[PDB]
Amino acid sequence: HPETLVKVKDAEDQLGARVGYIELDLNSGKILESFRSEERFPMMSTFKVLLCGAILSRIDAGQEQLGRRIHYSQNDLVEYSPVTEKHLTDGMTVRELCSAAITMSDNTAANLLLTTIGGPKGLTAFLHNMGDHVTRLDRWEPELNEAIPNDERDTTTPVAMATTLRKLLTGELLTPASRQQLMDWMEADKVAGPLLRSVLPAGWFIADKSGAGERGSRGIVAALGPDGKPSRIVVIYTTGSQATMDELNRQIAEIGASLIKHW
Q: Domain named Beta-lactamase class A catalytic: which ranges (predicted)?
């Protein structure tokens, strides 16, 4: 609805920073609304959804198993590894690592998963193969959150992310089992409290992943809908703002509140 686009521009202007928005029909793939949906933005932690999509894809093809255990050391640990720092001795399974990466945004977990598919370039290669020639990852956690102006590295567009995400949750991309798992992981997101979740009415379904980064970078990808079923995908990114984290959260939550209000 046009009134949501008004609030999107409001967030842009107030934030003093590019905001990127798209809303996509989960059923048809039809673009419902958009604003800067073809401009590149830092993917932030939102890339971890795509990462685990690639991983579930290797499982489907019998080149990986959900239950495979991986061991690592202290030296692999990077900033913000709430789950992985608690398993240096026992290791974690690929399932536990995707759960850590998606539901807890665990950084070292994301890196361990990435090593399995051949690094950032391997996730980029995977994405190419599934028909996304726009989204790219180039660096590892935490460096991929840097958001250097004009730097295309580690970016996607709202349209690319939305359509790739829609392809992973409802397409020929993954087996139904793998789709449901990715969805279930996103539904179990624990670290997007302040965003879309803050304004979501009781009874509504949400499966999401948020990110933050340097230079005021902030974003969220979500499958959401009323009556306990997702019917839409929403992608929001912003980069460049010098507003507070609270203000960034708030602007995104207000965009959510408009999209809910004008559903």
A: 25-238
Taking the CA of residue 115 as centre, how many other CA atoms within 13 Å lie in the half-sphere pointing to its CB?
13
Instruction: Look up 143 and say whether it is catalytic.
Output: yes
Resolution of the deposited coordinates, in angstroms?
Answer: 2.0
- Of 12, 34, 37, 45, the active-site residue reads 45
Distance from C-alpha of 196 to C-alpha of 86, rounded to nearest angstrom = 29
The identity of residue 256, as a single letter, is: G
Nearest residue to 152 (alpha-carbon basis) of 22, 51, 21, 43 = 43
Task: Provide the 3-class DSSP secondary structure of residue 213.
Answer: coil
- Label each residue of 10-77 as H, E or C: HHHHHHCCEEEEEEEECCCCCEEEEECCCCCEECHHHHHHHHHHHHHHHHHCCCCCCCCEECCCHHHC
CB 69 within 8 A of CB 43: no
Question: 1-263, which class in CATH?
Answer: alpha beta
Query: Beta-carbon neighbour count of residue 77 at 10 Å?
Result: 15
Considering the candidates 3, 38, 85, 143, report the single residue annotated as catalytic. Answer: 143
Phi/psi of residue 119, nearest 5 degrees: 85, -175
> What residue ranges do the domains of the chain occupy?
1-263
